[PDB]
Amino acid sequence: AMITGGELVVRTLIKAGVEHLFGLHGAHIDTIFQACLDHDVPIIDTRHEAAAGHAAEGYARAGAKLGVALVTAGGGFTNAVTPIANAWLDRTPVLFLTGSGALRDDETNTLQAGIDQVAMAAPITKWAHRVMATEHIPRLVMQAIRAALSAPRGPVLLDLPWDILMNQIDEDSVIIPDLVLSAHGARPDPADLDQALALLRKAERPVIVLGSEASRTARKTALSAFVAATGVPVFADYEGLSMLSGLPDAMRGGLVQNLYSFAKADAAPDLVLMLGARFGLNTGHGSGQLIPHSAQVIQVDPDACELGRLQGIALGIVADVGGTIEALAQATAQDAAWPDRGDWCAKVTDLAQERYASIAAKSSSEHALHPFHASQVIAKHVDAGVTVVADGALTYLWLSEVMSRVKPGGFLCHGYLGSMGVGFGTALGAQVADLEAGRRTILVTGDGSVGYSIGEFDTLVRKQLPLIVIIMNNQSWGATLHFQQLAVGPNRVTGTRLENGSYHGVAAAFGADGYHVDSVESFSAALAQALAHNRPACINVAVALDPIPPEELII
Template sequence: MPRPRSTDGGELVARTLKQFGVEVAFGLHGGHLDSLLVGFHRNHIRLIDTRHEAVAVNAADGYARSTGRLGVAFATAASGYSNAIAGLATAYADRSPLLLLTSSPPLRDAEQNALQGSIDQIAMANPLSKWAHRVTVVEEIPSLVSFAIRKALAGAPGPVVLDLPIDVLFGPADEARIDHGGGARMPAPPSPSPAAVREALGLLRNAERPVIIAGGGVRGRAASELLVAFAERSGIPVFNQQTSFGAMPADHPLNGFAAGHLAVLQMVHGKGPDLVLLLGARRGMFLGARGGAIVPDSAKVVQVDIDASEIGRFRPFDLGITADSAETLRAFLDTDTERWPERSAWANAAVMIHRRERSFANEPTVVNGRLHPFHAIRETLRALQPGATLIVDGGEMGSWVGESAHEARPKRIIGHGGYLGFLGIGFGIAIGAQVADPGSRVILLMGDGAFGLHLQELETMARHGLPIVTVVVNNACWGMSIHGQEAVYGNEAGIVSRLADSDYDIAARGLGAAGERVSRIEDVGPAIRRALASGKATCINLTVSGEVTHPITPTMVGYTDDPNTIVIPYYDNVPRR
């Protein structure tokens, strides 16, 4: 029989995480980690093991995005850690707070060509994390874990990495020498100055056409409630970056959904906002980059960000506030005592843009024998009960979802790709979101290209009893790729951008999930409702036409007939010299 273990490194990690309220960790087994995994088990931290380490980190990311709390992932030394790096990169780009725990060979075996010891894991993590550290003394584990958690959550959130060599994890701790560091308390987030609050309220009150653009800074229930309260008091419509969908209830009359709708607003009404409150929303690709289509050049800008370096990063601002978004909203509500002007006509015009009838609605439901993607996805969304969580993972497919997402009245939407445009993350994000909110229905909408990157995770969903419904929008191609090629190269399109029309539903059944292929428009709604009623992990193989191009694609690749312009797909074009 094994001897009773003394307190070791794995136990100290688990104990410290438990003190911070950690309830679940996502990862994949490796022998280096057994001490840690036993520690998790003994401290009643739930373990969700995936089939790929990148997906485990994505799941911790999805958990963090859904709750606003820390996500925790684990990956074994070297090979497992190398797989996990992809998930780490996404979390870093999108400011998602998570802790990645890994291991390595014994300290004494450095530079000895040891098993899984040929890479510098900390050097790999440095450009993709807020902080990375290799633990060398077992008694320092509580202090370093505490510091790592505060680092992940304080300021602009992001991922952190702890490398725990196997001899540190398995080594016994001297209880008298354990360093607990700062304990499990978190510091209060920064609040705005009273002067800045008064100035911001004055600018908002005096504007004729103000809007709020919410970003990742409003994640979490508290921030969401404060955002709703301030929007209702001021009557200012709220638009969202991909990182904040769900902060406003989907059916709220002041919810304008995607910030991109502001570009359409200017085209339809001739006038856009004259003041924009950027609330934890970074400027860049999701806000029109250098162009003024979403945030007009003529508009005043009040920018709130917990990271001062993001304020005015590459565009001017009229007032910058370095503070937590939730604390800023709280200060607005506490300070505001004056009556707000009547702006219902402006607010209604702004939010109705996303409810306008789409031109696609009049197009045929079938194109060359396959479903039109607009109709197929709209019927999918209409079949959902209000309050679902939508996870969107794909290129052009995500734009089709955006056309009708409001019809599902979702609790939240976690958008595709993020700043890295990383396809395939949907499986992990959905797993994390479902674990974070077991009572919610999680619907994962994926392009068939994205689906193929990690389809084995259907087995993870089935094995852990996660009733996620995965809808594969199957157009047998990399949609944005082939349609972007068509816009730029015409008949030369189709280079490494076609896929087989695969039986993803059969693959799902082989992995322990339910599966169904849907090819007729009248069958879409019933298939979705059956999947939801089953309470099982299910894959719907929704066959759509790859010959329909969403108009966002030629816009994104910057297509133009101007002979004096060089097209730079997905970025700003440059003049021909």
Template sequence: MAPFKFEKPKNRDILGGDLLAQSLRNLGAEVAFGLHGGHLDAFLIGAHDAGIRLIDTRHETTAVQAAEGYAKVSGKVGVCFVTANSGFSNGLPGLATAFADRSPIFCITSSPPLQDAETNALQGFHDQVVVAKPITKFAHRVTNVEEIPRIVAYAFRSANTGIKGPVLIDFPIDVLFSPPVLDRVALGAVDVPPVAPPAPDPATVDKLVSAWKEAKRPVIITGTGVLGTNKVLQTLAETTNTPVFYSNKFSTPIPADHELRGGPATGLAAFAGKEHADFVLLLAARTGFLLAGRSGAVVPNDATIAQVDLDGGEIGKSHAVNIGIVSDAGLFCEAFVAKAGGGFSRNDAWVKKCHDLNNIPLPYKQQEKVMPDGQLHPYHGMAAVMNSIPKDSIIMVDGGEAGQWASLTLERAKPHVAMVSTGYLGFLGNGWGYSIGAAVADPSRLVVNIHGDGSAGFHIQELDTIARHNLKILTIIANNYAWGMSINGQDLIYEKTSAARPATRLSQGCKYETVSEGFGCTGKRIEKHDEVESTIKELVEATPSLANMIVSVKPTTPATLSMVGVTDDPNWIVVPYYDNVPRPYYKQFENGLRANE
């Protein structure tokens, strides 16, 4: 990185907005996602002059999520801009997901002039820094134009070092539009060399080597933190003869055809109650509901568990961990391989068993491609989609049951990168922004933006953004005219007690293919199984494009069945999507019911 030197624009004064834009460009920012607001004009003009590409979206939530999608695919900090108060408030969901999912985002916002504080000025009601602090790594208001480069550099480093996450800087409009005193511009703390991430403790690595060599059925489960570890992770897997699975937050960089690629970690649930893994390395993969919680279905409770994470607080958060290591994932892989030597046994039967998980005979494979209601079976429809898209595409999975069908068939597509966009918040609609960011980060690949008709409705107006910027995105809507997980969950719980299914139906009259065409994208409707392959291949060549694939609301996905947790045992209270809880004082409760009969 060259030493930062600000440049005076031609034919006008240099302003705070120029300092902001040039500071970001000096730090490596090449693109920013956002929505226009007059508060930000000094920055937007400065960004244009500094060579930063501006991708303007139709909603601030999507802008922040596009910055996150860009960060997840590029490995760089995603930059976004939202205007004062109203735009800021719309951007909060994006900050919330980025904070929960540890994504490095630099969010720019503005506010009324400093002299107008607490005067009920336009777009000046909320103190944006106070509101943002709980869901950011760093939030700050710049009150001195000359300090912009220093604060920007500090915030940028905060976003992208250690446990990564979003930062937000509030630049009051008068600060952005004010010219700095040039010899007072704070440049001293701008050009800081990159901070080296933490490496693992050598003695703990030795302990892990010994434990790993004793394993008969080892697995590695990776998370988002393995971004950029492609070669060294593959070397780790090959050195230890260990199959690699991934949390659906981010697919493993192990090649699609490699014998040690096991697919989504949820597939390990097929071994529950059978001969399961006896050693699990959680490599930058957080435990929780994405790995079946504390049930032991994915991470067996009786296995030797090792966990590597940048955050020591995550280690052992929901599972008893035998070996914990605070380290960067890539540095851990390098250190382990350097110390490992030989002596790792190879269990060919286990390797094959793990590799074949994606081909196990799910009951859906044997079911008819058309359901009794005459509509396409969602499993077969999504499988046909995955078979029809180009290998090495980038796949964003959104929605409830639509997302689950996509995850079950994902490995068929042999994706370059795949991720479930809903994250730890279960946030529907993220896929639109993620797809936009991914398409900008890697324009060489097709981005497949998968939704149900529920999640699609959150930000479908971004088809306009996709068309205006001619992004290589194919949107797939698995349309069953319902909130699938919601209605199927109600069916499981209330089948015997109520016919009502409140707030679960969506319109059968919405023609998403027509909506797509109205926004300037190609649109096609798919109603039959033999139409899927040809239509998807046609739409791949016609991006930006959208397929409205009509599917049945049944059957219920296995994930919904397990998450709802219905039981006939009267001693348990069913708590949908969480662990059931024991009914307190059940005998007294039962006696009370009998007394009232």
């Protein structure tokens, strides 16, 4: 009944309800591999710790649950830092388990030792801690999980020295705790709820904007009830978008970017209810271009520092977003009938249609496939049964234009970090989460971005994960090339062209299905076929580089 520290880790994860880990093997963490083997817990082993970390993120994001990444000492850890930073800014609950040097061999200049991994993770985690005793493993794993899963969600690093993991202790000498942490987050004080609802009722042109915390708790039934009772149109940043998929068309404002054209239409919202949508990159910072300076803003966020960060607000509520949606649904299930907002919802719909039609009118594939047209080909296949993951730059900016009118099961795009390349691992992890849900994952990425993690075609084949990787190929680091041309000069393009390489050939050499396409017809055919089979695929799409997406034009 002597068991290893690594066995204690795995028993604790199991008791918490973890069903998959993502990682890459090292001797330092083998005890965890052996325990997962015994317990039939899959570790999805990748070709890079970064891909494993991003996979844990994608699993968390698509699955609305904890992601777990598992990496070895030294370079195992340092290779996971981009995932950690990405999860940090995206408020994604991932437990990063890392090996580290043995405590007993401290300061011996030995293999993989000497990196202060906790110090490196400290600025980009909710909690980072190195375990000092094997007996502490269960309680500190569970503590780490509680930290990651609590509002606002975020990454945690638990550093497990080699000797601490290999050490054996009496299995009965330590208790494995349950995960005892309410599923229901804290809600606003009723006075604050009443004030918010009074403002919502009085508003002429109210909107709701959802952020990532809305996605993490996924209170879809409560959201449906609230939106049906109030008739108020709902927008979202990228991470909140899939939370709109169960709402009636009339109340689906779509991506918050659509608010841009409202002021010129003499239709700026007079009230904005921000539900975990922060002031920042996706919401127009403090510019008032999306969230008008003239609007009264009610902001609900689990981090008080966010409240009116960049703009004056009328009511600032610290609460869980899911708990708040439940509270709002409960209140509006027992108050007076709400004002009819059909005309306002129709205006929202009309303005979105005007934007889309305008883009359609300008887009031509006469000489090369237009990114907007390529995006439309994808949109035809997007519904609740699909998770869309987006990487690249111009690629996702174009893709965003077709995403508001469809109802994705999942939509995982860049957040504040904007780190080219994170999409491949993210999508791989998403596809694992999507298995149990019967969903199909589609990555839409750039030719530049795909290069970061291209070895993961190997992993898709080894694990038979039927991810479809669509490469929007404009033979360049595109948005950066546009920057050079637009902000510097037409003759100042340097370090941004990528006029080499057959990505479908690379995919094929790893055993994945490869397609190369250059038109609406050819692309439509390839995508239809790839979706018809449960096989990993790479679709290399030749698209024009020169078109400027509306989001870049605005910038």
